[PDB]
Amino acid sequence: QTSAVQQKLAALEKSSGGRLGVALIDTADNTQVLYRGDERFPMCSTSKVMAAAAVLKQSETQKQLLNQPVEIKPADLVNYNPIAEKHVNGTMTLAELSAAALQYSDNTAMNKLIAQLGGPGGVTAFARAIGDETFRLDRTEPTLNTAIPGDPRDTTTPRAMAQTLRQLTLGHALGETQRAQLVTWLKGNTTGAASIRAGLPTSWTVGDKTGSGDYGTTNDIAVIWPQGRAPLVLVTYFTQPQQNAESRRDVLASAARIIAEGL
Ligand SMILES: *C(=O)N1C[C@H](NO[C@H](F)C(=O)O)C(C)=C[C@H]1C(N)=O
Numbered sequence: 001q002t003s004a005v006q007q008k009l010a011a012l013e014k015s016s017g018g019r020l021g022v023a024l025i026d027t028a029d030n031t032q033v034l035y036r037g038d039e040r041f042p043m044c045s046t047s048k049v050m051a052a053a054a055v056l057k058q059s060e061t062q063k064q065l066l067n068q069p070v071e072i073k074p075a076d077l078v079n080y081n082p083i084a085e086k087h088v089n090g091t092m093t094l095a096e097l098s099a100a101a102l103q104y105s106d107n108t109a110m111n112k113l114i115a116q117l118g119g120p121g122g123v124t125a126f127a128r129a130i131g132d133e134t135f136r137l138d139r140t141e142p143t144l145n146t147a148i149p150g151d152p153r154d155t156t157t158p159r160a161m162a163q164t165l166r167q168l169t170l171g172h173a174l175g176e177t178q179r180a181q182l183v184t185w186l187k188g189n190t191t192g193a194a195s196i197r198a199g200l201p202t203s204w205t206v207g208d209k210t211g212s213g214d215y216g217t218t219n220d221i222a223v224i225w226p227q228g229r230a231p232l233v234l235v236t237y238f239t240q241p242q243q244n245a246e247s248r249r250d251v252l253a254s255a256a257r258i259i260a261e262g263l
Contacts, residue, residue, distance in 0.1 A: 003033070003262075004262065005033055005258060005259065005261075005262035006033070006034075006035055008258045008262075009022055009035040009255060009258055010035070012251065012254050012255060012258065013035075016238070016248060016251045017240060017241070018216065018238050018239055018240035018241070018245070018248065018251070019036065019039075019041075019238070019239050019240075020035060020036065020236070020237070020238050020251065020255060021035065021036040021037065021039055021041050021157070021158040021235070021236070021237035021238070022034065022035040022036070022037070022158055022234070022235065022236050022237075022255050022259065023035075023037045023157075023158035023159050023161065023162035023233075023234070023235045024162065024232060024233070024234050024235075024259050025162050025163070025166050025232065025233045026230070026232055026263070027166070027170060027230045027231050027232065027233070028229050028230040032159075032162075033259060033262065034158065034159055035158075035255075036158065037157060037158045037159040038157050038158075038159055039157060039158075040152060040155040040156065040157055041155060041156070041157070041158070041217075041219070041237035041238075041239055042145070042146075042147035042148075042151070042154055042155055042213055042215070042217050042219075042237075042239060043135075043137075043144075043154055043155060043156055043161070043211060043219065043237075044144070044145045044147060044154075044211030044212055044213035044217055044219055045105045045107075045110075045145075045209065045210060045211035045212065045213075045219075046161070046209050046210070046211040046219045046220070046221045047110075047123070047135075047137055047144065047154065047211070048101045048102055048105070048110050048113070048209060048211075049102070049165065049168070049182075049186075049209050049221060050123050050126065050127055050132075050135060050137070050164070051101065051110060051113040051114055051117065051123050051137075052098045052101055052102050052113060052182065052185065053126065053130075053168050053173070053174060053178075053182060054113075054117050054122065054123055054126035055094055055098060055113055055116055055117065056098075056174055056178040056181060056182060057126060057129075057173075057174060057178065058116070058117075059094075059178060060174070060175045060178060065094060066093060066094050066095035066098070067093050067094075067095065068093060068094050069091035069092070069093055070091060070092055070093070070094065070097060070112045070115075070116070071090075071091055072084050072087045072088050072089070072090060072091065072092060072108065072112075073088065073089070074088055074089070076088075076108050076111065076112075077108055078107045078108055078111065078141050078142045079107060079141070079142040080105065080106065080107045080142075081106055081107060081108040081109075082104055082106060083096075083100035083104050083106045083108075083109060084097075084100065084106050084108035084109055084112075085108075092109070092112070094112075094113075094116060096109075097109040097112045097113055098113065098185065099185055099188075101113055102185040102186060102189065102209060103185060103188050103189050103190055103191075104190060104191075105191055105209075105210065105211075107141035107142055108141070110140075110141050111140050111141050114137070114140055114141075119140075120137040120138050120139055120140060120144075121137070121138075123135075123137040124136050124137050124138075127164065130164060130167055130168070130173040131163070131164075131167065131173075132156075132160050132163065132164040133160070134156050134157050134159075134160030134161075135156040135160060135161070135164065136152065136153070136154065136155060136156070137154055138153035138154050139153060139154055145211075145212075145213030145214060145217070146213065146214055147213040147214045147215040147217040147239060148214070148215070149215060149239070149241065158235045158236075158237055161221055161235045161237075162221075162233045162234070162235045165221050165222075165223060165233050165235070166223075166233045168182060169182060169183050169186070169207070169223045169233070170223065170231055170233070183207055183223070185207075186207030186208060186209060186222075186223060187205070187206075187207040188207075189207065189208050189209060189210070191210045192206065192208040192209075192210055192220065192222070194249040194250070194253065195208065195210050195218075195220035195222075195236070195249045195252045195253060195256075196208055196220045196222045196224075196234055196236055196252055196253065196255075196256040197222070197253075197256075198249070198250075198252075198253035198256070199252070199253035199254060199255065199256030199257035199258075199259075199260060200224065200226075200256055200257070200260050201226075201227065201260065203227040204224055204225065204226045204227055205224070205225035206222050206223070206224050206225075207222065207223045208220055208221060208222035208223070209221055209222075210249075212247050214243050214244075215239050215240050215241070215242070215243055215245060216238075216239065216240035216242070216244075216245025216246055216247060216248060217237075217238065217239045217240070218238045218239075218247045218248045218249055218251065218252060219236065219237045219238065219252075220235075220236050220249075220252050221233075221234075221235045221236075222234050222235075222256075226263075229263075234256060234259060236251075236252040236255045236256060238251050238252060238255075
């Protein structure tokens with residue numbers, strides 16, 4: 001069937017010119033709302049959640065891992081490095097790299113997380129270990145953001161990413177202290193106010209990770225603590241037909257507003 005909410009998301013999509021993917025899990029009843037939920041979208045910076053979680057999982061058997069220093073060299077800087085550039089010719093700990101990746105979207109920090117996992121496939125292997133058969137990371141930063149239509153590299157589906165974000169933040173894919181750390185990091189995101197959270201009531205608490213890339217790709221994945229009810233997980237992915245298209249965070253906000261009105 002097509003629900004009222006799906007029809008509204010289709011009208012939003014038609015006015016946007018691009019392709020919208022949405023997945024909601026309402027943990028009040030475990031019900032879902034999906035729009036293009038099984039179509040593949042480029043993840044861009046939203047893939048940083050899986051990498052940070054995979055290092056948290058390694059830290060469950062190594063109490064000092066998050067304090068381990070990693071060297072940052074000039075050659076390591078890529079296209080967007082506001083935290084790592086302050087530590088060139090020095091070090092950052094794996095905690096500092098995780099925080100920088102998630103809260104400031106530092107792409108050099110992401111590359112150090114990927115390297116700590118043995119390369120992009122180490123991120124994909126963690127996804128598989130927590131039940132996500134869909135996610136794939138194939139490249140490092142910055143080339144994982146090319147977002148070419150039809151390219152399977154560095155993609156997932158809305159349905160898979162919502163399920164995984166639920167298990168990471170609300171379920172038991174991580175140990176309790178690691179889950180709490182991931183939630184603290186997501187709640188302190190600096191980049192999210194124009195995306196999912198802009199479509200939700202102001203009283204609701206959000207932790208999120210955004211992403212953007214070529215083809216006007218504009219993404220957000222969020223855990224939401226609504227006033228008066230059980231948490232939600234919401235994924236909104238958006239991509240456009242022309243390589244140089246502009247970001248459309250307002251489309252993600254509109255999708256979130258439609259989802260919230262449908263509760
Ligand atoms: C991730 O998609 N990035 C890293 C960085 N992200 O910043 C915000 F979080 C965001 O854009 O969602 C930037 C500025 C761009 C992309 C990228 N293409 O590297």
